[PDB]
């Protein structure tokens, strides 16, 4: 899972 930004600029698992 690559780190990606969510709506609030925070880290979330990316595809």
């Amino acid at each position, epitope marked *: 899972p*690559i*780190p990606v*930004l969510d709506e*609030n*600029g*925070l*880290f*979330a*698992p990316g595809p």
Partner: antibody
């Protein structure tokens, strides 16, 4: 804004320690908590990051099996546990709050000394 | 992977000084989201620049970030005596940050 870290630690090789970083004066859940190791008072090494809302973590592969990041949303506190300690782990450890690929706040540091 | 900064630089009040941040992997890009962090005595760290050349809240307007050729750069436009400090850069490589060795900036104040 205050990122208050736990106080200095003197521990024996082989033990484990848990450093805490408690945020106040800001919205704890608006930031990731990142962790950094400062060796010799000079060089900085990134350890990892945790998002307090989803517990998503990314680690520097060099700290896998050394550092474990956790959070307690409720008490606006982030934790870093360092295990199987050796003298190479002696350092000053910093937490920092980040968002949008940017550091906004930094803790004061926690000195860890690993010695017999 | 290694991030390289000037060891030390000297400037005077009111002047422009430019600090640089090089990556061993090749050209620094915008997707390295270069951060600049100021270290003042007693382990006082202040984030200055991050994201895409974004000034952190409360940071004075004289600090700005950019790319210069293949490097990231921090420009202090009209340096102040209080800017004498150590400046670290950090670059993002997909899933981790790497810090440079820091630049000791003298501001002859």
């Amino acid at each position: 804004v205050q990122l208050q870290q736990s106080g200095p630690e003197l521990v024996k090789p082989g033990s484990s320690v848990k450093i805490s970083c408690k945020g106040s004066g800001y919205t704890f859940t608006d930031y990731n908590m990142e962790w950094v190791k400062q060796s010799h008072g000079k060089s900085l090494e990134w350890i990892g990051v945790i998002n307090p809302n989803n517990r998503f973590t990314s680690y520097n592969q060099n700290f896998r099996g050394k550092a474990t990041l956790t959070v307690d949303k409720s008490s606006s506190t982030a934790y870093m546990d360092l295990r199987s300690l050796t003298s190479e782990d002696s350092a000053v450890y910093f937490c920092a709050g980040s968002r949008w690929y940017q550091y906004d706040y930094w803790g004061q540091g926690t000195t860890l000394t690993v010695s017999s | 992977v290694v991030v390289t900064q000037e060891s030390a630089l000297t400037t005077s009040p009111g002047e422009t000084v430019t600090l640089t941040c090089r990556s061993s992997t090749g050209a620094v890009t915008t997707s390295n989201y270069a951060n600049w962090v100021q270290e003042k005595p007693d382990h006082l760290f202040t984030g200055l620049i991050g994201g895409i050349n974004n000034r952190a809240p409360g940071v004075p307007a004289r600090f700005s970030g950019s790319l210069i050729a293949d490097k990231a750069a921090l420009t202090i436009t009209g340096a102040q005596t209080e800017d004498e400090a150590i400046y670290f850069c950090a670059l993002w490589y997909s899933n981790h940050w790497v810090f440079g060795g820091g630049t000791k900036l003298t501001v002859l104040g």
